[PDB]
Symmetry: D2
């Protein structure tokens, strides 16, 4: 009987997960399910925990909902572990998205400057959690959604013995969903060759019933990409690529929404503020756990289907280290995901992905050594930072901004 | 032994035939030739007569011949070199101003300009070879004609000429540059260079063969203008072209006021050069070929010293394909340069130069094929261009700007 | 409606194939099926062609059997092409297996000296067949069983544009069948991680219902392997590995059977002589086409299951070139097989597999250039040849032996 | 500057302190030390007094000190070298005879013997380092103590000593060897060496820096004993240890009659050496350390010449891991040797040396761990051992043969 533990129990997305297991219970015999959160989130936990406990009873599935704060008990022989928390809360994402704004620089949640400090705050906690699993459940799996998944994944590989780790995004299932509606066709008649890193993944090839239709799909993309650029690239870009191929335009959006709706996080907070109110008794942001259940299932069941996840490269992509973390199509087995080969990333886009790995790597190191000097190198080399100078300012400032979460620097 | 030189009328031919006088000791050059296009016929002869002067003032039996008919200068030629500029220096003028409109760097071998400087040159280099194989299939090819980086690269991928080297003054500069600093003879200081042209690093700095790199950096950072902690944490030593990348903002602040005030360097040079021909009638900028004489000498006498040049990677830089071109330290040999092994670039700098490789490569294919889509991909993926849309505009404006010497597009 | 063409139509195994399609017709709508053979085999063709035509009618499957000698018509818009012929007939395998015997050297059919000349005879014909498909069916697939599959595959990749090529063996399905009977368990509860080259493939990992049981399976292997060797190797060896880890013992067998039953080919010939007699009107050697139909099906159907075949490495195995041919697990899709990553081959066994690739490569070249000098290098470096001298003798002798089939050498 | 030498009592110390006299010019060696184990105390002093002679006959202020207490000789030592033999030359006796029983090569650094010569040495080298870090963490380590190939390798993988070089006379031999041939000064001939120890190739041969390799080969093949066409088609130039591999049969014909007749070289040497100490009382085999003086000199004065040595691959040989050891040409530098890049080995020879790498690697791990299973895998996979079964027997016989100085097995 399966025991599952989730950290970030009081999340906005928590019901999407418990629904997912309900729809897929026949093959996923989940016994206990534990929801963990931290003291400054106890309220939101105890709210959706009941809604979970309600969704369950209304479906006749015998899933026991366990709510707790003593994380260490929820790991006591866990079988699978999911992580959907956000360190520093939404209030922290607000800082990440406005401090860059002063400087003309992107203030997104997982790219540029914000992404860096999202990691510095977070991946200590990830390693902190694993240091517990090595005592409470060393055979357990770590399935991870806490962003930046592609950097958090790289931490675990570089700084931990944990070989059992997987990361998820909704960018892949998004792009599929996706080119389906572009061809106006039942989605599972479409399969895409993914390769790249998280929030930096490409659709290398597109098949409709096994026949490549990548060219014809690309022509139909004319969120707007230049025809000649996209046609000439011969691959299909991720939504986060506008941050690198359409930078000024983006930038535009981050500026204007600040005056108006507020920042994305700010906009998020309200929508999230009033969403808990629904949860208090008797639709945007992610699918992150419709793609999480598919994975937890296939692993458990050894289904050996093909899903795009984050795992050890092992040479799937030539230019990325074998010991590093990529986001590619994997055969999904009980021993883990298993990368299908790619060869290398296409020339045109090979360097920019190389540019992001370097950033994740240096960022991951600083988050763990706590070394100011490393963190500064991290921002400056990032492609959404113009100068060492500006870099130093945002760094010195955002350091101070999240002092509470960044002890390793003091 | 018959040398031959393309772009005889260059401002730098002094620096050239001044190199040889200090090395007739080993270079039995009988007939030297200087060529140019009929559009520079005059500026050629203003210096041609200045050649025959100093080979008379130093007593050297070197036959100064001048010609427009290029092929007769490849009549049994043994060495062939290239310092010419396609489009004149008026072409460089457009490439520094058209980007200024858009906020994009208007440099001659970086960003948009670099793409176009290439797009013009490469097909001509290929033509020089096309009949270099005709009249000198045994002869060497030594090149400056920027962008040296993507000129070498293009030559490997689209020709069967194995006899190619590339030179830039960035390392030699950085040598004496760093040499001066400590305060010893250049003879007493050596550096490990790995990278590409205008993308080359002081990986380690030696003083007598003892590595002092941490010291040296700490001096540079605390006597250009580099952030201290950035420079210390990158633990290596940037090219002077790394400001366009690590200091992009400052660098375009500078390109603008210098455009209001004194004009772009193309323009500042256009006069200062049109006045240097003044002195060339009877009695700053580069080392680009004193340092590229040290080579040719070593090549003939097989001296096996250690000079930084541009040659087929052959796996010395792990992340660059072996079939591509890099700027690395090399053993010089009568059979060719032989790169020492670098391993791979440090992590923090690996993505950046991987981009430049990608840029060079795409810009190469566009220059040869003449494809618009490949060209736009070149302009978009370059780390100095903010949008597909900006890139789309600049590309059309500069294509049109140079209709004359892009006859493979039209 | 599918059109399939097979060369080597009059083969002993031909009925196993036509049975295979019969059992799997529901998903494999095979319209026409053509059986091709050559004049000196017309008799054996016209015999089993009727037995095929009989197996079909007795099953109610509407598969038209087409027998021919005009190969070029059988390819006229073929959809799939299989090759099971053997150049030089069984009489040629007799020579390959006895001429080494004089010299103390292995005389097997696809390893050592015999394998070399099996290639030199064969892979011209393979390329000869493809030179036809490029005119008659350029969208057709080439599925290949004609040994040596691992060398024949490498020819097509190196010397042909044909990207659509796959090779089969029964060694994989054999080893599975295999460790099943070793655990005494339903075979499809067992899946093995294959990696290596054809007739040189290893069972890297063994799973029973997704749990690795590789260790416990290996202990049960004690055809006998030393416990400590096999346990210490931590992988599972192919049947052809006794030729390299158990050499003298093998060698033994090839010697003794010569005195007695005759050579394998000789033994084969009788068993095959009397087997055609059964075929004339109203069980050993291979499964090579129970694994062929599984593949032709999955490709056609896009089943995306996992089968171990021979395809372009593309970095699936680090130490083997990306452009070369390996024998690994592949996801099987309509665009082709798709290698799951391996990383590299385990250290212990990495070199011996490297040793075989080199042999296939040099052998493949000589078979096509016809260069004596290359062929000599081929044998001498092979691991079952003791000296350049002996090498030269068997080479000079077997050259003469198969002059008729080896025109490229004269 | 205090040199220190382990295996002072070696037969070759003449060749050592004769090197230095021709290079006191640049080597300020004050106190030199010569050490050995108490079991060679006498043979040490027979030559120790011969040291103090020639540093008196040439007028050199080098303090010849002798000691058994090894550590006092590492008292502030600056250079450390190794020529000792573990087990005496009586141990080499067993390793050349025990294989003879089985038909297997009884060489000292190839096949079974090589494995065992290693299995004895490696753990001792690691011990010398274990306290070299104690008393000379700044000091270099230069090694001959065969097998040089797997001694270097082991040191990289199981120690943090970066300061290591390895020497063998095979290349220097092959130099003058090939130099002699044509008939010019050695100063006028250079070769490109790529491979491993006793597994090193003349990739190209230069005469003044012009490549004459095709000529040179055609001379060697038509004035050892190499097949003409084999040697011409391999287009490179084998080590004299490639007969054990490309001529295995002839090589054991020779080891047998030489065993009947004159005895094994261990024995032939045992006397010829016990009689060379005769002359060492008052007034053939190697260059293994005249050529390894040329190094130490270059290392101190940073001469940056080109000598073939054994160092961390660092990617110079593509197929060898970068973390492993190769025998390649190198630039010699006060910071260390710096391999020129080879690219990869030619195809025909790549598998062979990949095996030797595999052999070296396994033999290393067995020597350190002391695992029986790892040891048998080492003996079986070696390309000179015919069976697991033969290997099983030899391994037990030689383990027992050397119980004394394999204390990590017992």
């Amino acid at each position: 009987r399966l025991k599952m533990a989730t950290i970030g129990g009081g999340s906005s997305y928590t019901p999407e997960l418990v629904e997912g297991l309900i729809k897929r219970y026949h093959e996923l015999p989940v016994g206990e399910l534990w929801l963990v959160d931290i003291p400054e989130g106890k309220e939101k936990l105890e709210i959706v925990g009941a809604l979970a406990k309600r969704m369950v009873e209304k479906a006749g599935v015998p899933i026991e909902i366990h709510l707790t704060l003593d994380r260490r008990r929820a790991l006591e022989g866990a079988d699978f572990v999911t992580t959907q928390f956000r360190v520093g809360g939404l209030e922290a994402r607000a800082k990440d998205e406005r401090i860059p704004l002063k400087y003309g620089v992107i203030g997104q949640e997982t790219n540029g400057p914000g992404g860096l400090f999202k990691g510095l705050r977070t991946i200590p906690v990830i390693l902190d959690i694993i240091r517990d699993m090595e005592e409470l459940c060393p055979d357990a799996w770590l399935i991870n959604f806490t962003n930046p998944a592609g950097m958090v994944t790289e931490a675990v590989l570089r700084y931990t013995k944990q070989e059992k780790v997987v990361g998820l995004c909704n960018v892949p299932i998004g792009m599929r969903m996706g080119v389906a509606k572009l061809l106006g066709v039942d989605a599972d008649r479409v399969h895409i060759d993914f390769a790249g890193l998280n929030h930096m993944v490409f659709g290398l090839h597109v098949y409709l019933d096994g026949v490549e239709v990548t060219e014809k799909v690309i022509d139909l993309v004319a969120l707007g990409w230049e025809p000649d650029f996209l046609k000439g690239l011969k691959v299909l870009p991720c939504p986060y690529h506008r941050y690198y191929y359409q930078t000024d335009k983006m930038l535009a959006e981050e500026l204007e929404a600040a005056k108006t709706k507020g920042t994305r996080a700010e906009v998020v907070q309200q929508l999230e503020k009033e969403l808990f109110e629904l949860y208090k008794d008797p639709r945007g942001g992610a699918y992150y756990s419709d793609a999480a259940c598919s994975l937890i299932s296939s692993i458990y069941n050894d289904k050996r289907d093909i899903q795009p996840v984050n795992t050890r490269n092992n040479g799937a992509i030539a230019s990325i280290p074998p010991e590093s973390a990529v986001e590619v199509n994997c055969v999904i087995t009980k021993d883990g995901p298993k990368p299908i080969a790619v060869g290398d990333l296409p020339v045109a886009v090979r360097g920019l992905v190389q540019q992001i790995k370097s950033f994740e790597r240096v960022a991951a190191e600083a988050a763990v050594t706590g070394d100011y000097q490393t963190a500064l190198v991290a921002m400056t080399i990032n492609p959404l930072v113009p100068s060492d100078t500006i870099a130093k300012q945002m760094l010195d400032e955002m350091l101070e901004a999240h002092k509470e979460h960044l002890p390793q620097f003091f």
